Design a protein around this ligand. Structure first.
Ligand SMILES: CC(=O)N[C@@H]1[C@@H](O)[C@H](O)[C@@H](CO)O[C@H]1O
Ligand SMILES: CC(=O)N[C@@H]1[C@@H](O)[C@H](O)[C@@H](CO)O[C@H]1O
Ligand SMILES: *[C@@H]1O[C@H](CO)[C@@H](O)[C@H](O)[C@H]1NC(C)=O
Ligand SMILES: *[C@@H]1O[C@H](CO)[C@@H](O)[C@H](O)[C@H]1NC(C)=O
Ligand SMILES: *[C@@H]1O[C@H](CO)[C@@H](O)[C@H](O)[C@H]1NC(C)=O
Ligand SMILES: *[C@@H]1O[C@H](CO)[C@@H](O)[C@H](O)[C@H]1NC(C)=O
Ligand SMILES: *[C@@H]1O[C@H](CO)[C@@H](O)[C@H](O)[C@H]1NC(C)=O
Lengths: 192, 215
């Protein structure tokens, strides 16, 4: 019952997800801690409620239901019931009646992990450091950045040093090697 | 009450090392020789950003409050020194009609003889804190001098801010989008700066991109 698009007694009266839910649902079998032989009536659930929920209504409100036309001031005799029941979890229950711990993860400050390579000096590399990129030779430097400075710039606004973010040491980026290939020749008329 | 800002209110505008170079830049900076409002805890506008500076003798000035409405209607910043710690929180705080110290949250963190200098600005929902500290021996104003505030703290708050107040002398001015020419020295510290739009000689220095000009 725990999804976008799904229906049921929980999905109408306890726990709705938006039908385009930004997130995931995770669940695992918990017979081995949530259940004991006396009946772990510890966990409750909303068996009855008027109208329907919206997504994410944790409506703790607990008063007697009443269906059709009757008044009800407690007593809960007929056509009116107390809205909650316990789960009768016991370690001897069958698989579909066992307890399960559910977690829903629902979705700027959060990110997954961003994973470094080891760092190679004195070779031509296609580098990335924090937000930037380049092609270069990365080399140890005698520059002295201030503690908060992360990059360092050449006079024509071209980056030419960077702080490594893990080991706080300064690299002197050099451009990777390029040059013209000139062919030097006597005339073909002579020799090839 | 008011006083003259002189040449204060320069901070390092981005985290990039520049060395022995006169880098021209535009950002929210305090205009040179503008008036700062002078205080010995009223609620103030924040506008585009604030330069706050505070002369100290006994740890009198403990922190700041920032928001739009500043009374639990929406989330709001509280930054405080309390004895041996610094606190930062962003909660829909109920705030007192006169907040002071004796003798729904999304971000929380808990770790005259002096002048303290601070720049507060809010850009694309990130809130920027730049600051500097120094000894002094002055009793009535910000001392005429030059200092560059390094960044400290750069918080993904996402909150709107248009009003702030202090918690317990201090001085307040507002940042504006102006061109500055910054002299980065041989070690990458900003040792001097020129506010272009100040006077014809500053426009000249900036247009030539030098702190000195021949005839
Ligand atoms: C202590 C506090 O400020 N609680 C508020 C609550 O009154 C408000 O209804 C809700 C809106 O989502 O945000 C939270
Ligand atoms: C945190 C917050 O409420 N920010 C609001 C933003 O959502 C709104 O679009 C803008 C309108 O100018 O004013 C500010
Ligand atoms: C990164 O981890 C190393 C240990 O491998 C540690 O020595 C270094 O100080 C850490 N750096 C930062 C910035 O946390
Ligand atoms: C160059 O080659 C041509 C043949 O294609 C020949 O007739 C001519 O004499 C040669 N000249 C020289 C200087 O080698
Ligand atoms: C306000 O600033 C001007 C300079 O622009 C100055 O002449 C004037 O005296 C200042 N006002 C006060 C009350 O200090
Ligand atoms: C400052 O106040 C915080 C509560 O916001 C408390 O946890 C901390 O221990 C206090 N620090 C000192 C030095 O009193
Ligand atoms: C740069 O900093 C070092 C300390 O790390 C200091 O010895 C040196 O004199 C400084 N250079 C300049 C030009 O201030």
């Amino acid at each position: 019952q725990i999804a976008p698009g799904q229906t049921g007694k929980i999905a109408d009266y306890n726990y709705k997800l938006p039908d385009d839910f930004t997130g995931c649902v995770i669940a695992w079998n918990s017979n081995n801690l949530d259940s004991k032989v006396g009946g772990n009536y510890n966990y409750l659930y909303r068996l009855f409620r008027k109208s329907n929920l919206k997504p994410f209504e944790r409506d703790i409100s607990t008063e007697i239901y009443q269906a059709g036309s009757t008044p009800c001031n407690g007593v809960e005799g007929f056509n009116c019931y107390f809205p909650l029941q316990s789960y009768g979890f016991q370690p001897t229950n069958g698989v579909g009646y066992q307890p399960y711990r559910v977690v829903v993860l629902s979705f700027a400050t959060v990110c997954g992990p961003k994973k470094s390579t080891n760092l190679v000096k004195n070779k031509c590399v296609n580098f990335n450091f924090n937000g930037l990129t380049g092609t270069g030779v990365l080399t140890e430097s005698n520059k002295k950045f201030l503690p908060f400075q992360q990059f360092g710039r050449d006079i024509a606004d071209t980056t030419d040093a960077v702080r490594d973010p893990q080991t706080l040491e300064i690299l002197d980026i050099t451009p990777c090697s390029f040059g013209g290939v000139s062919v030097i020749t006597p005339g073909t008329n002579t020799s090839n | 009450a008011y006083t003259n800002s002189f040449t204060r209110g320069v901070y390092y505008p981005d985290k990039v090392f520049r060395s022995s170079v006169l880098h021209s830049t535009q950002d929210l900076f305090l205009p040179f020789f503008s008036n700062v409002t002078w205080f010995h805890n009223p609620v103030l506008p924040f506008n585009d950003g604030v330069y706050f500076a505070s002369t100290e003798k006994s740890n009198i000035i403990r922190g700041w409050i920032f928001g739009t409405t500043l009374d639990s209607k929406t989330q709001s910043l509280l930054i405080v020194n309390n004895a041996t710690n610094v606190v930062i929180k962003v909660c829909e705080f109920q705030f007192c009609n006169d907040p002071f110290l004796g003798v729904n949250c999304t971000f929380e963190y808990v770790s005259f003889k002096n002048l303290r200098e601070f720049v507060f600005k809010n850009i694309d929902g990130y809130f920027k804190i730049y600051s500097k500290h120094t000894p002094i021996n002055l009793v009535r104003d910000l001392p005429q001098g030059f200092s560059a505030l390094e960044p400290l703290v750069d918080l993904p708050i996402g909150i709107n801010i248009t009003r702030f107040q202090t918690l317990l002398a201090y001085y307040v001015g507002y940042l504006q989008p102006r061109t500055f020419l910054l002299k980065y020295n041989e070690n990458g510290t900003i040792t001097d700066a020129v506010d272009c739009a100040l006077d014809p000689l500053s426009e000249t220095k900036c247009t030539l991109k030098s702190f000195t000009v021949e005839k």
